[PDB]
Ligand binder design. Structure first.
Ligand code: ALL
Length: 288
């Protein structure tokens, strides 16, 4: 067992594959050993809990983690903090109110500005639709996930400021390709004048693009994703997706590791009452 553990969401999604490789590179750069785990699937709240708990029970100095939901890892993260492990939250913000109640904290949180991500996606759709504007929809991540909610809120508030836009639907598809395809299919059927989807990640954006194609509407309905996974960047380049707000999961991972290693060197965990370190990794809009 290595010095440090990492718990990621699922390597079924290239975003997490790239974060894993970023962390592995940074561990070599820093000269520290890392064990990296992930759940089979997005659905696996309980397994991810048991996985975290199994790690906390061994001899790791620190754990960096991206929880599947805001709440599923609260109790095991508290347990690790109590035991004196250096904890870093990656990407997906844990519920800090529930974590405090459980008697835990984290050294730091490393993420994208997910409000600005939503805003960039919406601002690009507003720019593309021009003065005519029209009806738009948001395809959300899992309800209550800080990542998704922030992108929903940034996009919504951007759309609201533009008179010529009407947000007709804003619905969860739980980071799932087929659920995103079903939701978008139904949004299209109910809203024959839809002009655009903003999608809180690329897994969902690719299902949305498939819904648009199925309805005969490629190019006529814009599709904007988030993450910049390889298949979405290809869809963008080929005009099957309009754009994606790329993230840098390698840098989120590498920055989170270094924050964990820097914290462990102080030889005391953050006090319950202290505000964690906060580091932002840039986003970039990818277009044709
Ligand atoms: O795992 C689903 C999604 O989780 C979010 O928190 C990440 O920032 C990525 O958008 C990822 O695709």
């Amino acid at each position: 067992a290595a010095e440090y553990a990492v718990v990621l969401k699922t390597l079924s999604n290239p975003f997490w594959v790239d974060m894993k490789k970023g962390i592995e590179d940074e561990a070599k750069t820093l000269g520290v050993s890392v064990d990296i785990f992930a759940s089979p699937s997005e659905g696996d709240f309980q397994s991810q809990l048991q996985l975290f708990e199994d790690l906390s029970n061994k001899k790791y100095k620190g754990i960096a983690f991206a929880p599947l939901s805001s709440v599923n890892l609260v109790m095991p993260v508290a347990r690790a903090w109590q035991k004196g492990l250096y904890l870093v939250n990656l990407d997906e913000k844990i519920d800090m109110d529930n974590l405090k109640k459980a008697g835990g904290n984290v050294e730091g949180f490393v993420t994208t500005d997910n409000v600005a991500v939503g805003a960039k996606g919406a601002d690009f759709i507003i720019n593309k639709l021009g003065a005519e504007g029209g009806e738009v929809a948001i395809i959300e991540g899992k309800a209550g996930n800080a990542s998704g909610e922030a992108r929903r809120n940034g996009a919504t508030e951007a759309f609201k400021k533009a008179n010529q836009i009407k947000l007709v639907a804003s619905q969860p598809a739980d980071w799932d390709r087929i659920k995103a395809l079903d939701v978008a299919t139904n949004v299209l059927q109910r809203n024959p004048n839809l002009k655009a989807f903003y999608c809180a990640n690329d897994t969902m954006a690719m299902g949305v693009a498939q819904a648009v194609a199925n309805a005969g509407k490629i190019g006529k309905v814009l599709v904007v994703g988030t993450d910049g996974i390889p298949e979405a960047r290809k869809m963008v380049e080929a005009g099957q997706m309009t754009a994606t707000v790329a993230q840098n999961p390698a840098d989120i991972g590498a920055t989170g590791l270094k924050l964990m290693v820097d914290a462990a060197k102080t030889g005391k965990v953050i006090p319950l009452e202290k505000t964690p370190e906060f580091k932002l990794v840039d986003s970039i809009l990818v277009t044709k």
